[PDB]
Amino acid sequence: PINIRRATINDIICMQNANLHNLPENYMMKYYMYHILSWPEASFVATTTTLDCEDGRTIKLDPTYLAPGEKLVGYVLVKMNDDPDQQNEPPNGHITSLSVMRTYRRMGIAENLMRQALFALREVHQAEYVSLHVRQSNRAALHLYRDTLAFEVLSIEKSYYQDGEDAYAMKKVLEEKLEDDLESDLLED
């Protein structure tokens, strides 16, 4: 199954690999180090997991492997806006990149990664809004970010990506369900 957790620098080599496989927009390691070492509580990864059973023990020499029986399938790379010009501006975050292996779609991973990312920005950095870019032809992403995560389309940036495609710049400002009360004993009856 898929595990969701906070990222550390032990993930960035594989994160680079995911990016290199899933996207044309690529960065050198130092750019990942820059993120993970500046905002160490903001980016999250989705990995596979191999739990011990009551009945894959070594790491495969494979560029997607984070650890024995654990390979990266997705990540959301996040930062706060650290442009000096906007130093006076209210604190805001940016989704540098979000990627999920297509073979792992229809599982809510991208959304899960995002919901954590957004909360991390709100809690750890008191971010007042967050923004990101998607390709115009990306309807799934548009749907996810706007219809599910309530982002708004702020601008349409012409010729944003390398191949000349236009981007949608999106931004977002930051009941009685059943839930653990965190007191009562979970076991009964």
Partner: protein, 782 residues
């Protein structure tokens, strides 16, 4: 005294350089290097200026000249040289000159921060600490200088000192933490609590103190995840499990998709190893978190009842099949791996049942994706016919899904049909020409088929080619190890193939063909080794990328993350792709060693020369990895013509790995084969020994090494280690892997090569055709 006249002009040159105006700074300098020419200061600064504008070779000359004319210098000269050495990655040298600057009486206390960084970079924290302290003394004003010091103290084991350094600033800073600094403060509060926790060990009183501190800082700590995790852990070490249980439940609530939190909760409740109560636990958590995996999935790892298990398995898989989830099988694959015999038949029946009640026309999504699942199911069980049939059925229904082509290609890969698999992925690529994922899959498969040019052309659809014909350079530029390694392993196979055709040659057409294959074999051996060598360059760069963070992390205020970076940096040369490159490149280096040890047409010829050297030009532009100025050896000629293979392997690959690697992840088979060639037959006995302890003396490979080691005793090479290794035997006086190993030394050890080749070809029966044909084509061959 017109020396003041020239010295003031130099100071002007220095200021001009500081302003990032090199050109000017040079003009003024060249002026001084006319009346004097032996002015060390200007020579140095000139060297530095030259470097800044790209005149690298001449810079080195002026720096070399300056240094030769010094053997002391002015504090500024030493300083300027320190910088040049820092820029050219000569860090130990940089530390010497930056140090000399101070010895020769520099007043610039800012040099200590430069040293602190360099000394940290080369892993000399004992001295880095000395620099962090002096700098800290000279500038108590900036918090970064405090955090820097605490880290240096932390790293040097001075945990109490580190704690006191952090605490000290807290006291001075009380009531003076602006909102823009609250984050750094929050990070330093947690970093301190980290050190206290490390020191607390398992001391109950010390531990309760760390918790007291944790609740003290909670309101100013924004890393709620990091804090709650620390809190839970302390409770566990205090044996207060009920409290820990609460913390874990809080963590789970914050991120109910993190398996770790659950597994840890089990322990805190004491119900680990009690399936009845675990099933109970997750049943309740499923109510709270109905859309998360752990509650649904974890029961699948322990439930012993075949009935409830089958039920729970259905509830997990079928909904995913109904929603058309491609990753349904992968989600349960680790169960197929750890509970193969118990789970796979239950899922086979479950899914086979499900399929039977589906209508292809009314239920198209579940239908095709159920077939997809089953194809993977039987592929995993190595039943390829069925795997083929079920994916065939999916494609029959809907041939527009990229996944079906990948799974199909994958099945043929296991059947040993690379070329065909590549073709099938190529077919699928047409469905999504704008998706780089399927593109990369395709590139990889063409490489497995040794079709490099096709691979390169496909990959080049997504690379940023500017002044190049393909994406090979950009792929090196962006550190794409997945490609470079795979392509290196391809070049190696092409090198073995072409070597065969070259050995298969026995009127002048054969001669011309002979010269063409000789070239290709040379070309491929060279590029295979050159590509493998790109990896250690990437990772040496990863190591060097730390430099700026020794300072940046201190100023940004992320000491915890920074320490993790240091841990990361000290494990770089143990990473999978690196070890892969190293291990695979050893085949080449080892061979090149064993081989270095064992073994009128003027006019027309001038036309034949300009013809082959004209194609080589066209070929170079296609295989060039690095920009022309930075690399003249595009085919790896120098790499393969080396006369120090075993050394180059150690220098470029093995040393860095051997120094960082943990004993419990070490490749003793590799150590054995490396020392055997180095001559250290003593470490060979150690390898076999240390290897024997972890895998037993029953392993066929264990015996293979031993037999190759026994033949070493008599009669080679110096008597001393021959006797030491010969007397070492006191501690010890199928299996295809074992037979294949002994074959690799059919030469050194005296055994019938033909007879052994027969035994290996008999132990191949079981192995899948893919692994089967790999050994018959590349492992055992004339």
């Amino acid at each position: 005294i017109a020396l003041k006249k020239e010295n003031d002009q130099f100071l002007e040159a220095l200021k001009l350089y500081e302003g990032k105006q090199y050109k000017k700074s040079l003009k003024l300098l060249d002026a001084i290097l006319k009346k004097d020419g032996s002015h060390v200061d200007s020579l140095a600064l000139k060297g530095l200026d030259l470097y800044s504008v790209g005149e690298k070779d001449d810079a080195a000359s002026y720096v070399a000249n300056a240094i030769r004319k010094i053997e002391s210098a002015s504090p500024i000269c030493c300083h300027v040289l320190g910088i040049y050495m820092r820029n050219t990655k000569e860090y130990k040298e940089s530390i010497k000159w930056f140090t000399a600057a101070l010895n020769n009486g520099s007043t610039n206390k800012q040099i200590y921060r430069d040293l602190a960084t360099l000394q940290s970079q080369i892993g000399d924290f004992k001295n880095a600490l000395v620099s962090r302290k002096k700098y800290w003394e000279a500038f108590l004003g900036y918090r970064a200088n405090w955090t820097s010091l605490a880290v240096a103290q932390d790293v040097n084991g001075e945990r109490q000192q580190a704690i006191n350094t952090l605490s000290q600033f807290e006291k001075l800073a009380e009531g003076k933490i602006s909102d823009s600094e609250k984050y750094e403060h929050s990070e330093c509060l947690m970093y301190k609590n980290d050190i206290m926790y490390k020191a607390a060990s398992d001391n109950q009183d010390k531990l309760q103190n760390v918790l007291k501190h944790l609740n003290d800082i909670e309101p100013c700590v924004f890393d709620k995840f990091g804090l709650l995790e620390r809190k839970a852990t302390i409770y566990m070490k205090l044996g207060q499990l009920k409290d820990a249980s609460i913390v874990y439940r809080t963590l789970i609530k914050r991120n109910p998709d993190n398996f770790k939190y659950y597994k840890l909760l089990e322990v805190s409740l004491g119900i680990q190893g009690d399936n009845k109560l675990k099933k109970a636990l997750y049943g309740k958590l499923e109510q709270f978190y109905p859309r998360c995996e752990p509650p649904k999935f974890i029961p699948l790892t322990f439930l012993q009842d075949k009935e409830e298990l089958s039920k729970k398995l259905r509830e997990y898989v079928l909904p995913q099949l109904e929603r058309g989830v491609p990753a349904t099988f992968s989600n349960v694959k680790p169960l197929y791996q750890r509970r193969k015999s118990k789970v796979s038949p239950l899922l086979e029946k479950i899914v086979l049942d499900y399929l039977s009640g589906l209508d292809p026309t009314q239920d198209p999504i579940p239908f095709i994706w159920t077939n997809y699942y089953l194809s993977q199911h039987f592929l995993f069980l190595k039943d390829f016919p069925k795997a083929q049939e079920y994916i065939d059925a999916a494609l029959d229904h809907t041939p527009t899904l990229v996944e079906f082509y990948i799974l199909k290609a994958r099945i043929l890969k296991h059947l040993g049909l690379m070329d065909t698999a590549a073709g099938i992925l190529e077919e699928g690529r047409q469905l999504d020409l704008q998706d780089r994922f399927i593109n990369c899959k395709t590139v990889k498969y063409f490489l497995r088929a040794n079709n490099i040019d096709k691979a390169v052309e496909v990959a080049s659809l997504f690379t940023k080619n500017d002044d190049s014909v393909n994406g090979i350079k950009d792929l090196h530029l962006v550190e794409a190890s997945w490609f470079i390694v795979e392509q290196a392993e391809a070049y190696y196979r092409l090198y073995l193939d072409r070597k065969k055709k070259l050995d298969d040659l026995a009127s002048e057409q054969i001669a011309n063909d002979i010269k063409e294959n000789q070239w290709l074999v040379r070309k491929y051996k060279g590029l295979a080794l050159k590509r493998f060598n790109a990896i250690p360059k990437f990772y040496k760069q990863f190591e060097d990328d730390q430099l700026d963070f020794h300072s940046y992390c201190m100023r940004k205020g992320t000491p915890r993350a920074y320490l993790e970076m240091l841990e990361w940096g000290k494990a770089l040369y143990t990473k999978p792709m690196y070890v892969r490159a190293m291990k695979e490149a050893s085949k080449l280096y080892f061979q090149m060693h064993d081989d270095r040890l064992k073994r009128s047409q003027k006019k027309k010829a001038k036309k034949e020369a300009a013809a082959m050297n004209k194609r080589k030009e066209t070929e170079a532009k296609s295989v060039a990895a690095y920009p022309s100025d930075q690399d003249n050896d595009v085919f790896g000629e120098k790499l393969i013509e080396t006369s120090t293979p075993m050394e180059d392997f150690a220098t470029e690959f093995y040393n860095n790995y051997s120094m960082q690697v943990r004993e419990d992840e070490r490749d003793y088979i590799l150590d054995f084969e490396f020392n055997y060639r180095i001559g250290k037959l003593a470490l060979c006995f150690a390898s076999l020994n240390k290897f024997a302890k972890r895998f037993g003396t029953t392993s066929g490979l264990f015996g293979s090494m031993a037999i190759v080691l026994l033949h070493a005793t008599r009669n080679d090479t110096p008597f001393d280690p021959i006797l030491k290794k010969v007397v070492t035997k006191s501690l010890e006086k199928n299996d295809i892997n074992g037979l294949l190993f002994l074959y690799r030394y059919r030469d050194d050890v005296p055994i019938g090569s033909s007879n052994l080749k027969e035994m290996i070809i008999s132990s191949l029966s079981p192995l899948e055709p893919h692994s089967q044909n790999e050994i018959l084509q590349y492992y055992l061959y004339p």
